Design a protein around this nucleic acid. Structure first.
Ligand SMILES: [Mg+2]
Length: 116
RNA sequence: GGGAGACUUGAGUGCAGAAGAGGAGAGUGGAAUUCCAUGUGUAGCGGUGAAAUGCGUAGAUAUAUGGAGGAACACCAGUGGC
């Protein structure tokens, strides 16, 4: 119901950006994404859509009561920063920013190149 | 060229060292993917030039904690090595 510390997971891919705000224990509290704000197609991948997604999820998160979050950024999407700053704007206190992009230490064979 | 000798440079042995993803066998490590279980959580997720098929309110994706299994070995790493 009422939290004081949390973490905001910015899952930003090439196609879409999902913003998920959890408590420090990883339990979800609020989440938004470019797709759930009406953005479709390439628009979902833009920094502005990432910005709007962060705002909509931030405001819901602060309705619960939540002051300061740390940010984990993942994926190659262009909207990582626009989300990080949007968190600060809408009211949250961004204390730390980390990169948690998974990296195989090799790992599995990736899919084929998109031509031929 | 054949025969009987002699020789130490070619070739090999000894002795002393040097480096190495050379090979074979048996173990073993972490990262990641997938699946599985359990919380949290809510309507999307995924994808393209643009879309749709697909997946999701029988609760997804995300996120947290674990479990299983397979394959490949980030950095080191280099017209570097064998
Ligand atoms: Mg194919």
């Amino acid at each position: 119901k009422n939290i004081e510390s949390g973490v905001a997971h910015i899952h930003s891919t090439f196609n879409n950006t999902i913003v998920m705000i959890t408590d420090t224990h990883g339990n979800a509290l609020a989440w938004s994404s470019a797709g759930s704000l009406g953005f479709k197609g390439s628009k979902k991948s833009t920094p502005f859509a990432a910005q709007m997604a962060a705002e909509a999820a931030t405001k819901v998160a602060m309705e619960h009561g939540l002051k300061t979050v740390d940010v984990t950024v993942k994926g190659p999407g262009s909207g990582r920063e626009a989300a990080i700053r949007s968190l600060q704007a809408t009211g949250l206190e961004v204390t730390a920013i980390r990169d948690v992009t998974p990296v195989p230490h090799x790992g599995c064979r990736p899919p084929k190149r998109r031509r031929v």
